[PDB]
Amino acid sequence: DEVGALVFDIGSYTVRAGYAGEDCPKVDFPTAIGMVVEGPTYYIDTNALRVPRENMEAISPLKNGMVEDWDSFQAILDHTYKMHVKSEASLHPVLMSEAPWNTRAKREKLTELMFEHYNIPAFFLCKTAVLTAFANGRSTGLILDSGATHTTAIPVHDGYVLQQGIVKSPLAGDFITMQCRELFQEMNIELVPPYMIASKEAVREGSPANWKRKEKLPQVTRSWHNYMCNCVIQDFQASVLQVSDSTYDEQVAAQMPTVHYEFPNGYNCDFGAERLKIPEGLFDPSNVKGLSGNTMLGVSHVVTTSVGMCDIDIRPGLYGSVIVAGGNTLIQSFTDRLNRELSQKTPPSMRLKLIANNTTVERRFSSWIGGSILASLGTFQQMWISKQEYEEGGKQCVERKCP
Amino acid sequence: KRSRKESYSVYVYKVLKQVHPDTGISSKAMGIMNSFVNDIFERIAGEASRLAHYNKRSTITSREIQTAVRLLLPGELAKHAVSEGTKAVTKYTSSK
Amino acid sequence: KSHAEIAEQAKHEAEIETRIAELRKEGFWSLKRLPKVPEPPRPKGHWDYLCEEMQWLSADFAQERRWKRGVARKVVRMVIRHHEEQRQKEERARREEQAKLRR
Amino acid sequence: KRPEGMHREVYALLYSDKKKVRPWKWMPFTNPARKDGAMFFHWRRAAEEGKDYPFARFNKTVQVPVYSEQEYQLYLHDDAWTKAETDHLFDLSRRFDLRFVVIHDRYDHQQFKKRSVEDLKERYYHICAKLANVRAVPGTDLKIPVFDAGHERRRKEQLERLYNRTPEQVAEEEYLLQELRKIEARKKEREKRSQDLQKLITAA
Amino acid sequence: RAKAKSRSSRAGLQFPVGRVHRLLRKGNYAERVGAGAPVYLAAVLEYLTAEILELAGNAARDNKKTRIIPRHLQLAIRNDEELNKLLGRVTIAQGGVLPNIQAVLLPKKTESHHKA
Numbered sequence: 001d002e003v004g005a006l007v008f009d010i011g012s013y014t015v016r017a018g019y020a021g022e023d024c025p026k027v028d029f030p031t032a033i034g035m036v037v038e039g040p041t042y043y044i045d046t047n048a049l050r051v052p053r054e055n056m057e058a059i060s061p062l063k064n065g066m067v068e069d070w071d072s073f074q075a076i077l078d079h080t081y082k083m084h085v086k087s088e089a090s091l092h093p094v095l096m097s098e099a100p101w102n103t104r105a106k107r108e109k110l111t112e113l114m115f116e117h118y119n120i121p122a123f124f125l126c127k128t129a130v131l132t133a134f135a136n137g138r139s140t141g142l143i144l145d146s147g148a149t150h151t152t153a154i155p156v157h158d159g160y161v162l163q164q165g166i167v168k169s170p171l172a173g174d175f176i177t178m179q180c181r182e183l184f185q186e187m188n189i190e191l192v193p194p195y196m197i198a199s200k201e202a203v204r205e206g207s208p209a210n211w212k213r214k215e216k217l218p219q220v221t222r223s224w225h226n227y228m229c230n231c232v233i234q235d236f237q238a239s240v241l242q243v244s245d246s247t248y249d250e251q252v253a254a255q256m257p258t259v260h261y262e263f264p265n266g267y268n269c270d271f272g273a274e275r276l277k278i279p280e281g282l283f284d285p286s287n288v289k290g291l292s293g294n295t296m297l298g299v300s301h302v303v304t305t306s307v308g309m310c311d312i313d314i315r316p317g318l319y320g321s322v323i324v325a326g327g328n329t330l331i332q333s334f335t336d337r338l339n340r341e342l343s344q345k346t347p348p349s350m351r352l353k354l355i356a357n358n359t360t361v362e363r364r365f366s367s368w369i370g371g372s373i374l375a376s377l378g379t380f381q382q383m384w385i386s387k388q389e390y391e392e393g394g395k396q397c398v399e400r401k402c403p
Numbered sequence: 404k405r406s407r408k409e410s411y412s413v414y415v416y417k418v419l420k421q422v423h424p425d426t427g428i429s430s431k432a433m434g435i436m437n438s439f440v441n442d443i444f445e446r447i448a449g450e451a452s453r454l455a456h457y458n459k460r461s462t463i464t465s466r467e468i469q470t471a472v473r474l475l476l477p478g479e480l481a482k483h484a485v486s487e488g489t490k491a492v493t494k495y496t497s498s499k
Numbered sequence: 500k501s502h503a504e505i506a507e508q509a510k511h512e513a514e515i516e517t518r519i520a521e522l523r524k525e526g527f528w529s530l531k532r533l534p535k536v537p538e539p540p541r542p543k544g545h546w547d548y549l550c551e552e553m554q555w556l557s558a559d560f561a562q563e564r565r566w567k568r569g570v571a572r573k574v575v576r577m578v579i580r581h582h583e584e585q586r587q588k589e590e591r592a593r594r595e596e597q598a599k600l601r602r
Numbered sequence: 603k604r605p606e607g608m609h610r611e612v613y614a615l616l617y618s619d620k621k622k623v624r625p626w627k628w629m630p631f632t633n634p635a636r637k638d639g640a641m642f643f644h645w646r647r648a649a650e651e652g653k654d655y656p657f658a659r660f661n662k663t664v665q666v667p668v669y670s671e672q673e674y675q676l677y678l679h680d681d682a683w684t685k686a687e688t689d690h691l692f693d694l695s696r697r698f699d700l701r702f703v704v705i706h707d708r709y710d711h712q713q714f715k716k717r718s719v720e721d722l723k724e725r726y727y728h729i730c731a732k733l734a735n736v737r738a739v740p741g742t743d744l745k746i747p748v749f750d751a752g753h754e755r756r757r758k759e760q761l762e763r764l765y766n767r768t769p770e771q772v773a774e775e776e777y778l779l780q781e782l783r784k785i786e787a788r789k790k791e792r793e794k795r796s797q798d799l800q801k802l803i804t805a806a
Numbered sequence: 807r808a809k810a811k812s813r814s815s816r817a818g819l820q821f822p823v824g825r826v827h828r829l830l831r832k833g834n835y836a837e838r839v840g841a842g843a844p845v846y847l848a849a850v851l852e853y854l855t856a857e858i859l860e861l862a863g864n865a866a867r868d869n870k871k872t873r874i875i876p877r878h879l880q881l882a883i884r885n886d887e888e889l890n891k892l893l894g895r896v897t898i899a900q901g902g903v904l905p906n907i908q909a910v911l912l913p914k915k916t917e918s919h920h921k922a
């Protein structure tokens with residue numbers, strides 16, 4: 001059942017690669033790898049990417065959870081294979097995750113790219129929602145994945161995704177980063193990434209930062225500077241932001257304790273109601289500046305819409321198995337707000353139940369853990385796409401063995 | 404705000420199923436079995452306490468319980484309980 | 500009572516009328532709810548075997564993660580105990596000098 | 603002298619009341635459940651190098667029937683369904699273990715017109731029943747209990763009506779719930795009691 | 807820490823040695839209960855319960871029933887020589903005494919042909 005394999009979870013934010021059967025991925029690095037057109041050189045290591053040099057324009061090999069640069073994809077695959085894996089691809093089957101909305105053309109091109117270039121013994125392309133359901137202990141249920149690019153509610157019934165029930169919303173990590181940018185700009189906060197700081201001195205709360213700029217600066221692009229700024233913004237998110245328990249109330253938002261945070265340049269200040277007004281857009285995009293439009297569906301709205309487009313015979317099961325995953329889901333009180341909104345919306349007959357997985361490893365790596373336990377099953381041995389299957393049936397075999 | 408009450412229904416149904424896989428037990432029969440368990444518990448405990456007190460001892464030990472079982476259970480019923488208890492103590496101290 | 504009972508009784512007739520109105524609205528009792536479902540199950544189902552093995556292995560993986568974290572906690576607390584007991588053993592070597600005097 | 607020599611408690615209770623040579627190796631193996639002969643590897647023992655793969659038994663495929671072109675053209679002809687429209691249904695059934703809740707989604711709506719779940723299932727079961735009725739010797743469950751698609755349709759519709767009930771059909775619906783008992787008690791306790799009391803007054 | 811093992815599992819008993827020792831230590835039966843007293847008590851309780859349950863199941867199977875009832879417990883307790891000696895003072899709710907057979911009526915007297 002357990003054979004030496006490599007489960008690849010290529011997320012839009014981070015790519016997780018490891019051996020099937022492990023509790024955690026072997027490596028986890030940001031997906032927005034820096035690129036320099038020298039062929040082009042790519043850096044697939046946190047210590048080799050977030051470095052004060054080497055312009056490294058961020059190419060983001062994938063976008064919207066789908067492959068968009070096959071050359072950069074080959075480069076990142078090669079680096080992951082001989083940097084942390086350090087093994088011949090021909091000796092290990094490959095189980096790779098895919099976005100449910102991934103087109104067949106991509107699927108097939110990726111499949112053939114792993115048989116004529118890497119010559120892997122077997123292949124399999126499973127959807128992220130299926131893997132998530134597989135990990136959390138449910139074959140039927142709704143997968144709520146609030147990633148960096150999009151927040152999606154993917155209904156899984158009997159291990160298969162119901163495309164008609166897929167609902168997507170652009171309110172994701174990118175939206176949170178944009179809101180944090182706007183908040184910093186409104187509070188006259190200079191977002192100085194670490195690579196620009198030579199040294200700093202402790203200053204009083206709210207006072208201007210006293211930091212020295214490095215004289216021998218790197219030759220960075222606007223893209224790489226924005227990438228460093230977005231990393232700092234994501235740190236700020238993980239450190240400060242918190243979802244409101246109930247619908248955002250300005251009066252109640254001003255009664256919550258503040259959270260202290262110091263930027264890399266030394267600037268530090270306490271945040272009050274501004275840290276709880278940003279995460280409200282995820283659930284209620286109406287009260288969002290610059291987002292003038294009601295078509296955007298909130299997390300609870302996305303869930304209810306995804307469940308509504310499915311057959312009523314399975315909606316009870318979907319509500320009874322609503323798996324929450326993604327990095328954005330790690331924000332404080334997000335789960336409580338989501339459960340409250342769903343209980344208020346979910347009809348009484350439908351027994352709402354939220355799986356109690358909330359750990360960072362359990363959340364961000366749910367998709368990878370799913371494939372890890374799926375490739376370790378003896379029953380899964382009969383579903384592999386063997387090299388002979390690809391050589392005979394061609395690239396289109398991906399559509400039959402792993403629909 | 405719950406007022407939970409305990410019982411041996413968990414170790415008696417288990418014993419029943421291990422000795423009688425196919426035969427069940429009703430709720431009232433379970434209560435009667437629990438009452439018997441508690442009554443024998445009280446009897447053995449009181450006998451061991453009194454036996455220890457006779458010897459000017461402030462501790463009830465396995466020997467006191469063994470002699471109390473010898474005294475209470477009649478004829479060819481004590482021996483079996485004593486043997487079971489001794490074999491459980493020997494298997495308990497052996498760290499198995 | 501037993502006088503001017505119309506004020507109380509006409510309410511029941513109004514409630515009957517509202518009951519008919521609601522039956523027209525969505526329905527009081529859904530007509531013929533789940534009368535027949537003859538779909539015969541598969542002999543076993545490959546997917547049902549896969550789901551059984553999936554449950555078996557997922558429960559195992561979860562328990563194994565929990566047990567691994569518990570064992571890590573155990574070993575860390577054990578090394579902390581080793582250091583604390585080394586210092587307590589220095590103190591007890593002093594107490595053993597005292598006990599040797601005593602002996 | 604006391605023999606003892608054993609544990610204190612057990613002793614008192616008893617007396618007071620008188621080379622491995624099995625190497626694991628990385629072995630290749632072929633799974634009988636596969637027809638392509640794909641060679642996989644497994645961590646097996648040395649005592650069973652060459653034994654068949656045990657999990658192959660968990661490969662019972664669904665019993666989707668297969669029929670010839672002539673049989674189709676003769677018996678399974680349908681004005682509303684063409685071969686290109688019918689073969690895809692059975693292909694999806696064979697591919698997804700004959701579950702219609704997933705087959706509907708997989709339906710290629712580009713080349714094929716939109717079909718519900720109930721009508722797809724009805725067409726499938728009708729094709730199966732015809733294949734059985736045109737077969738005598740193989741005993742293909744001639745009397746298949748084909749479900750009534752119309753009853754299934756109205757059931758799907760009434761329960762869907764019972765689904766969306768937010769404004770007043772779930773909260774104010776408690777009124778109709780209480781009425782379910784009031785009308786079953788008040789109506790009787792009024793009219794039948796009126797009859798009974800009239801008969802009593804007649805006897806009185 | 808190490809995986810905690812209960813005391814019922816070590817000895818190999820089903821009844822709770824833990825709860826037994828608990829009732830004992832704060833039951834005022836003594837000042838400092840021994841470590842082996844509760845194990846032995848639970849073992850004897852388990853043996854007696856197993857015996858009475860065996861007898862009750864036998865009586866139920868003889869009566870063609872699946873669920874044990876006070877009838878079966880009473881029958882088992884009063885049939886066994888030693889359990890009755892142990893539970894002579896005890897009375898059971900919804901129980902009954904051992905019955906007599908009515909077949910004796912047939913070959914002595916029955917309804918005659920008079921106006922039958």
Ligand SMILES: Nc1ncnc2c1ncn2[C@@H]1O[C@H](COP(=O)(O)OP(=O)(O)OP(=O)(O)O)[C@@H](O)[C@H]1O
Pocket residue numbers: 010011012013014065128145146147148172173174176234237238239326327328329330331363364367
């Ligand atoms: N500790 C944290 N606290 C709060 N938010 C976080 C934390 N860590 C990451 N995030 C947010 O989560 C986002 C990353 O999402 P994640 O990587 O889980 O999606 P994903 O699994 O890659 O989705 P997909 O598989 O569809 O690509 C980031 O944009 C970041 O803002």
